[PDB]
Amino acid sequence: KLAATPGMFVQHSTAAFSDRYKGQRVLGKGSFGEVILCKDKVTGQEYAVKVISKRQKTDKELLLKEVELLKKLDHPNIMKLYEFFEDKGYFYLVTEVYTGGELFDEIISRKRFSEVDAARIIRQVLSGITYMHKNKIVHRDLKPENLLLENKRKDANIRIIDFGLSTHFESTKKMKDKIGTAYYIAPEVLHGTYDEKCDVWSTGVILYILLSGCPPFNGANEFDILKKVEKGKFTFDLPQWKKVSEPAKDLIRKMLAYVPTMRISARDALEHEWLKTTDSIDVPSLESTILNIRQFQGTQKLAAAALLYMGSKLTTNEETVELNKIFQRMDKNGDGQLDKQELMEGYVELMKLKGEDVSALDQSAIEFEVEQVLDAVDFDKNGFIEYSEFVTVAMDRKTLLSRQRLERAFGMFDADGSGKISSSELATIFGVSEVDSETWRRVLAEVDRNNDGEVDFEEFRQMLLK
Ligand SMILES: CCOc1ccc2cc(-c3cc(CN4CCNCC4)cc4n[nH]c(N)c34)ccc2c1
Ligand SMILES: [Ca+2]
Ligand SMILES: [Ca+2]
Ligand SMILES: [Ca+2]
Ligand SMILES: [Ca+2]
C-alpha cells in the first residue's frame, strides 16, 4: 500500500509566498531571519511563518533535513508544519501557530507551578520526546523558550518547537557535538559523549524549575553555570521545596541522575506515579466519538488521502479540543499512539459507564473487533493510531467535511488546476512517482461517474459524502 501520512502533504511549493499570505506582526526574530504571523489572504486563517534569509549550498541541505524530520513527526505535543516556500532570497516555513507564548514567559509571570500543572506539562513534554526517541530522533535544545502553549487558556496544551539542533541517533555510536543551553545542558554533552538521555536531563531541569521557580544549577554567568552543571550536584534545600511531595522529587532525582545508564528513560519517566497527578468527559461526546470510529470503513486511497489531509492539516486546535481530551485519556501510557489494548480498554471503560456488565465480555470477540477498527483506521499501516489519524476518523464527518474544507482539499489535489484529479496528481499527493495501476483502477471503479478517467469536484464530493 501507498502509506498515507500527514507529512507527505507538506511539499516544496514554487508558488509565491506573497501570492497567498500577508504578514501581520513579528513573533520573534532570530539570527536566521524572523518568525512572522501571517494570514491566508483568502481564508483569513492565521499561521506562523519562519522566514530565513539566504546567503550558499551548505545552508539548504542542512535545512531540508530539519524539514524532513518534522514531516515524520505526527504527535500532539510536537510542532505541526504545513508547507514550505522557497524564494530567490528566502525560505518560508509555514506552520500552525501557538498563541500562548513561551512557557518561559509563563514561568516569569506565574513564578511557581502547581504539582498538577507541572505534571501535566512535563507529562506532555515527556510524551513528545518518548515518541521522538522511539523514532531515533533527539531534540537536544529543550528549554521553556522552546516550549509553546497552544493558546491563552489556563491549562493549555504544550508544543515542543525548533528542531534545528535535533538529529538522528543510532544506539551503535554516540554523539560528540556540544549543543544545548547553559542551565539545561546535560553533563555528558559537555564531556563529548552523549545519547538521547541528554533530553531527559534537560526536561529534568525544566521540572525542577517549574516546581520551585529557580534553576537547580546556577551561577554568576555562563561559564560558572557550566562548571556547576558539570559537577552535577543539586539540592532540595530551598524553603519552597518543603511544600512539594516526595514522589515529585524522586522523579527529578531519577531524571537528573548523573550517570546516563542509571538515568531514567523518557519512556519509563511517563509511567512514574507522580505523572498521573490529576484533579472527566461527557458520556454523549465520548459515545459519539467511539461510534464514529467503529463506523469508519476503509476506502480507496484517494478518499483516504483527502480525509487525512482535511483532518491532519485543515482542522484547527479549537475544533479538536474535545477530541484532544478523549485521545489523551485513551492513551493510558501517554506515548502519543493508541495501541490495540488502549483501544480495547476504551471500549471497556465506556461499557462501565453505560452500566454494561464487565464479566459478560467476550474478550476474544472484542479483540477481533478492535483488530478490524485498527486495520481500517491505521492510515499508514504502522499498527498504531496516531493523533491525526484519530481526529480524521473520530470527528463527525459533516463537521470535518465542512464545505470549505472539502473545496480546499480538492484544490490542493488538483494541482494543475484542470478541475479534475488525475492519477499523476494522486501520485504527487502521496509523494511517489506514479500510482499502482491497481490502486488507480480501485478508485475510478468506485468514483468516476462520467467515466472520463478523472475525478472532478462533484465526483469528489459524493465520494466522501456517502
Ligand atoms: C523548519 C521550519 O521550522 C520552524 C518553522 C516555524 C516556526 C515558528 C516558530 C514560532 C516562533 C515564535 C517565537 N519564538 C521565537 C523563538 N523562540 C521561541 C519564541 C512563536 C510561535 N508561535 N507559533 C509558532 N509556530 C512560533 C518557532 C519555530 C518554528 C520552526
Ligand atoms: Ca499509547
Ligand atoms: Ca498509524
Ligand atoms: Ca488536474
Ligand atoms: Ca470523472
Side-chain angles (χ1 to χ4, degrees), residues 154-242 244-389:
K154 281 92 53 39
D155 307 297
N157 194 37
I158 297 281
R159 290 286 165 107
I160 288 158
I161 53 160
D162 222 291
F163 282 77
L165 299 173
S166 325
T167 189
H168 282 98
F169 71 83
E170 18 157 30
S171 64
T172 328
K173 211 147 218 205
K174 269 144 166 287
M175 297 167 293
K176 37 169 156 161
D177 298 334
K178 147 137 48 116
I179 279 163
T181 292
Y183 294 100
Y184 314 97
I185 193 157
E188 59 267 28
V189 196
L190 302 190
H191 294 165
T193 314
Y194 66 97
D195 63 2
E196 78 270 353
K197 299 263 186 58
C198 51
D199 281 338
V200 163
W201 180 283
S202 319
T203 304
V205 170
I206 297 173
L207 181 45
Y208 178 103
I209 292 155
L210 286 164
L211 291 152
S212 60
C214 284
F217 302 116
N218 227 345
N221 56 94
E222 200 177 48
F223 170 68
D224 260 6
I225 292 162
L226 293 178
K227 260 175 67 195
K228 202 61 153 266
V229 154
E230 189 276 338
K231 260 71 95 52
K233 317 238 69 177
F234 63 104
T235 189
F236 300 108
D237 180 13
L238 297 163
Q240 49 261 52
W241 290 106
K242 183 274 293 294
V244 188
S245 69
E246 241 308 315
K249 292 145 170 179
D250 183 77
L251 170 56
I252 289 172
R253 288 176 202 107
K254 290 170 159 78
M255 292 185 64
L256 303 175
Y258 197 78
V259 173
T261 43
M262 259 234 75
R263 200 180 294 153
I264 194 170
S265 69
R267 173 149 286 247
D268 285 295
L270 280 163
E271 333 295 293
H272 203 279
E273 172 200 352
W274 187 71
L275 286 186
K276 301 161 218 311
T277 279
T278 354
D279 61 358
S280 80
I281 295 165
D282 66 318
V283 179
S285 92
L286 177 68
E287 208 173 356
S288 316
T289 311
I290 288 261
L291 194 145
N292 285 157
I293 285 159
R294 289 183 75 187
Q295 294 188 332
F296 183 84
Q297 221 57 279
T299 166
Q300 94 290 141
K301 288 306 207 172
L302 176 56
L307 291 148
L308 180 65
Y309 183 51
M310 295 160 58
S312 76
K313 297 327 204 194
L314 277 38
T315 56
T316 72
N317 296 181
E318 314 297 70
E319 287 171 81
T320 62
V321 296
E322 285 285 355
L323 292 176
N324 186 248
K325 285 192 285 154
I326 295 147
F327 182 97
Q328 286 177 334
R329 81 163 292 94
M330 286 194 331
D331 194 3
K332 319 287 199 236
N333 72 343
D335 70 355
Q337 261 160 43
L338 290 163
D339 71 30
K340 220 151 75 69
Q341 212 189 179
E342 287 164 335
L343 286 152
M344 200 187 191
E345 287 168 49
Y347 185 73
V348 175
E349 144 201 293
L350 169 61
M351 249 44 198
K352 298 170 191 289
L353 260 45
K354 295 269 146 205
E356 252 78 306
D357 191 26
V358 170
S359 313
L361 339 111
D362 186 333
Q363 272 284 331
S364 311
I366 293 153
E367 223 148 287
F368 172 71
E369 222 255 13
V370 176
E371 270 152 47
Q372 299 305 109
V373 164
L374 230 163
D375 180 46
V377 174
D378 180 16
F379 281 89
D380 65 346
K381 304 293 170 197
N382 74 325
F384 292 101
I385 291 161
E386 285 78 46
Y387 189 50
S388 277
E389 299 189 330

Side-chain angles (χ1 to χ4, degrees), residues 27-29 32 35 48-50 52 63 66-67 70 79-81 93-99 101-102 145-146 148 161-163:
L27 287 123
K29 274 270 184 71
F32 52 83
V35 188
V49 168
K50 164 151 165 163
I52 304 166
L63 183 63
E66 196 197 327
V67 168
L70 273 175
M79 217 201 334
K80 162 172 291 179
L81 179 64
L93 274 325
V94 194
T95 105
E96 179 151 302
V97 42
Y98 312 90
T99 52
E102 298 181 357
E145 292 78 331
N146 271 330
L148 309 186
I161 53 160
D162 222 291
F163 282 77

